[PDB]
């Protein structure tokens, strides 16, 4: 401990057994350190040794397909503090795809300040569930330990004791010959020695002497001359949030490695410079810079690799590239966007530039500031440029904004089928590689074949939108040859969005969201166009045309490509209010409710509605009883490509024939109630009569200022509730009693009409006799002013009276007593 070794710059270990004994004399690592793709080395080649000569690294670590590694103590048996200022994957530790390893070497690493832990994509790796992520760093709800085979605790792990401190999983451990340092969870990241407690109290990762701040290898508050004060006092400044160092020392630190350099800023002596500040080497301080400025960036060892989609290597603002670059990003299916995700903020590439699997882009417009290449550092094979897998690239860069020049470097144009050779020669002349006689490896037997770079735009000669169709015609176009034309290809889809793409929705035979129509070549004239065949009213649509033409064996395209237009269909008469229901709410008031129409046709201004009263016929009263790319399937999928191949062969067949003939043939010389409901689904009316039917017209409107346009009418016939009590017998029930068994009865008509009255129930009874019912018809009542009893029995009779209508049913009025005598 106490940093007993020399400070070395960044390094890497790759493909040999001689490079596995380098870090043994380096105690401070300034730069990147990686171990990846060891296939030339074998399992027993590796050796095992423990050395306490490493205490810090100042950059990310990356393990990748290391074949033959049996322990991680061989090269890191003393690493205690890990943090970096330059990120890669945004993580500080990156174990990507390692295998043939069965134990770690970091039972001392418990201080993590910058970056997180990424344990994912790890096959055949044991000891991933015998590590306390709450001990090494913050709790596990902030670390993505997923996508592995140790999420289910595969493998058996033996940890001494089952020395090991108090704690598949039995105890925590990292190696079979060394135990993990474990202490209470509350410490979190403070580290600890094996005492079952945080090392001193507020240290960080580990400390030489427990209970002493002086020995904290790192603590939680900036360390200054033997203390861990909250902030650093002047002239000292912060340092990676674990140290206090002054200006002269902030300088001498980086000057000693002469690596990484630190500069005072924000009271932060850290290895960074704000946006756009280049260095001046008198003190290696951050100095202002204008224009493009690569500021701080690590490029040591004349090269740098990019094997991630996001890192703090090309987003810092390092435009000028002094090193090399190699892209090996794993996964995905488009290196276009993968490349863009790393060099999105850099527009001038002064280093090794290359592109692969070109897709989703047909022209480069992200390298519009590159105008010079230094080439001071030698590139692999002295080549500064390569081209490969460019199968969607249709254009190179402009020559009045780019102005590139090469002072060192070579060109390699291979496997560029879609690009035309004109742009290639442009590269050769603007870059000026051939102009210096430098050797270039060119392969045009694979380039300038099946290419097209002619993108001429066509315009719509005439347009006529309707509310359910759209007519479109475009200027007559003829390629260099009149015969070379197979029609046009109008492509369209509905699009209210002001940002839509054409790649999703086509190029398949099971689904088609971008409907495609074809058009016969024009008369040799006549304007070729297209007319919609019905569309939803009040909708916005994206439309464009692309000319289809016969291609030669040379595979040359004279095509034309019109642009996309946004044409919006017009409105039409509203639809009917969905689910119209008219139901009574009282006897004098009925209500109407509905749902908005099926097809609104733009903004609604009101609802046209009418209503009228329906009465009851008098006859009712006088009656008595006395693969896929988009949702769903297609309806316009395209013809099979083999069919196209054959029709093309037949076309060119007849063509070759025509030419053969031309050759052999020629030889050279020797009123109604109405209501208006403005944007509401309810309706209420009042001033109606008990048990009365009402019919109500109903429509929906969307515009009423220059015309009256509304949905078709609808009708519902409903009747307010009936008043059952309104049928009770009222009116003086007058009796005319005689001694001859004759009693003239007089009861009056029920209070309310209550619609049709079927009859009057006269129940004249006696107590000890049979009950005698009488059905008083309309005629009988109206003619008898009630009723009369023709023949009777002696005794005091009683006649309950209840009129019968059909509004529900009345109640038997008081029994009216009449003492019959004879």
């Amino acid at each position: 401990h106490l940093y007993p070794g020399e400070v070395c710059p960044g390094m890497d270990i790759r493909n040999n057994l001689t490079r596995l004994h380098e870090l043994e004399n380096c105690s401070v690592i300034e730069g990147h350190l990686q171990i990846l793709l060891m296939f030339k080395t074998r399992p027993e080649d590796f050796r095992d040794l423990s050395f306490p000569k490493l205490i810090m690294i100042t950059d990310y670590l990356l393990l990748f397909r290391v074949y033959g590694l049996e322990s991680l103590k061989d090269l890191f048996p003393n690493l205690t503090v890990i943090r970096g200022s330059r990120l890669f994957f945004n993580y500080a530790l990156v174990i990507f795809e390692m295998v043939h390893l069965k134990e770690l070497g970091l039972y001392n690493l418990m201080n993590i300040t910058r970056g997180s832990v990424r344990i994912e994509k790890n096959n055949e790796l044991c000891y991933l569930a015998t590590i306390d992520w709450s001990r090494i760093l913050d709790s596990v709800e902030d670390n993505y330990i997923v996508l592995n085979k140790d999420d289910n605790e595969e493998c058996g792990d033996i940890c001494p004791g089952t020395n090991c401190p108090a704690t598949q999983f039995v105890e925590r451990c990292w190696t079979h010959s060394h135990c993990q340092k474990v202490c209470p969870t509350i410490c979190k990241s403070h580290g600890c020695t094996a005492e079952g407690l945080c090392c001193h109290s507020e240290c960080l990762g580990n400390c030489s002497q427990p209970d002493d701040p002086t020995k904290c290898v790192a603590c939680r508050n900036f360390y200054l001359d033997g203390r861990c004060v909250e902030t650093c006092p002047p002239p000292y400044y912060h340092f990676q949030d674990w140290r206090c160092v002054n200006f002269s020392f902030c300088q001498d630190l980086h000057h000693k490695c002469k690596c990484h350099q630190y500069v005072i800023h924000n009271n932060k002596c850290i290895p960074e410079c704000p946006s756009g500040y280049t260095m001046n080497s008198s003190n290696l301080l951050c100095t202002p810079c204008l224009g493009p400025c690569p500021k701080v960036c690590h490029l040591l060892e004349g090269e740098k690799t990019i094997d991630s989609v996001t890192s703090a290597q090309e987003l810092r603002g390092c435009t000028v590239i002094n090193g090399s670059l190699i892209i090996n990003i794993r996964g995905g299916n488009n290196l276009a966007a993968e490349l863009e995700a790393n060099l999105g903020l850099i527009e001038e590439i002064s280093g090794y530039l290359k592109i692969r699997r070109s897709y989703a882009l047909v022209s480069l417009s992200f390298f519009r500031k590159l105008r010079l290449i230094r080439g001071e550092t030698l590139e692999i094979g002295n080549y500064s440029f390569y081209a490969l897998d460019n199968q969607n690239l249709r254009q190179l860069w402009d020559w009045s904004k780019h102005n590139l020049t090469i002072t060192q470097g070579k060109l390699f144009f291979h496997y560029n089928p879609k690009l035309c050779l004109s742009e290639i020669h442009k590269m050769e002349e603007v870059s000026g590689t051939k102009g210096r006689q430098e050797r270039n490896d060119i392969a045009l037997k694979t380039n300038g074949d099946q290419a097209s770079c002619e993108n001429e735009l066509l315009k719509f000669s005439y347009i006529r939108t309707s509310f359910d169709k759209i007519l479109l015609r475009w200027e007559p176009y003829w390629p260099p040859d009149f015969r070379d034309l197979l029609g046009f290809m109008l492509f369209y889809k509905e699009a209210p969005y002001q940002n839509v793409t054409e790649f999703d929705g086509q190029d398949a035979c099971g689904s088609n969201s971008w409907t495609v129509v074809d058009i016969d070549p024009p008369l040799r004239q006549n304007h070729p166009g297209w007319l919609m065949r019905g569309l939803k009213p009040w909708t916005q649509y994206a439309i464009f045309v692309k000319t289809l033409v016969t291609f030669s064996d040379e595979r040359r395209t004279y095509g034309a490509k019109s642009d996309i237009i946004y044409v919006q269909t017009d409105a039409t008469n509203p639809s009917v209010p969905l689910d119209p229901i008219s139901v009574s709410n009282s006897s004098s008031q009925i209500i109407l409710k509905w749902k908005p129409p099926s097809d609104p046709n733009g903004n609604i201004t009101h609802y046209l509605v009418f209503w009228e009263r329906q009465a009851e016929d008098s006859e009712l009263f006088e009656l008595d009883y006395c693969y896929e790319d988009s949702a769903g399937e297609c309806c316009s999928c395209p013809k099979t490509d083999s069919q196209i191949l054959k029709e093309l062969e037949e076309s060119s067949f007849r063509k070759t024939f025509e030419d053969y003939l031309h050759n052999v043939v020629f030889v050279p010389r020797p009123h109604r109630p109405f209501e208006k409901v403005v944007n509401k689904e309810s309706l209420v009316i009042s001033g109606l009569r008990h048990f009365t039917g009402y019919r109500i017209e109903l429509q929906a409107c969307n515009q009423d200022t220059p015309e009256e346009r509304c949905s078709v009418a609808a009708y519902v016939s409903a009747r307010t509730m009936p008043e059952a009590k309104a049928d009770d017998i009222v009116g003086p029930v007058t009796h005319e009693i005689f001694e001859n068994n004759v009693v003239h009865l007089m009861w009056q008509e029920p209070k309310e009409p209550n619609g049709l009255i079927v009859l009057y129930e006269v129940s004249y009874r006696r107590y000890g006799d049979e009950e005698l019912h009488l059905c008083v018809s309309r005629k009988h009542f109206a003619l008898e002013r009630g009723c009369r009893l023709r023949g009777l029995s002696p005794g005091n009779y009683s006649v309950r009276i209840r009129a019968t209508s059909l509004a529900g049913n009345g109640s038997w009025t008081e029994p009216t007593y009449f003492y019959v005598t004879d």
Binding site: D481, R483, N663, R669
Partner: peptide, 21 residues
């Protein structure tokens, strides 16, 4: 080959007059 010269570039009258004698 008249079609190999007039369907590649617009032939002038001399190049057309050629195949009449």
């Amino acid at each position: 080959g008249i079609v190999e010269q007039c369907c590649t570039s617009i032939c002038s009258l001399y190049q057309l007059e050629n195949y009449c004698n």
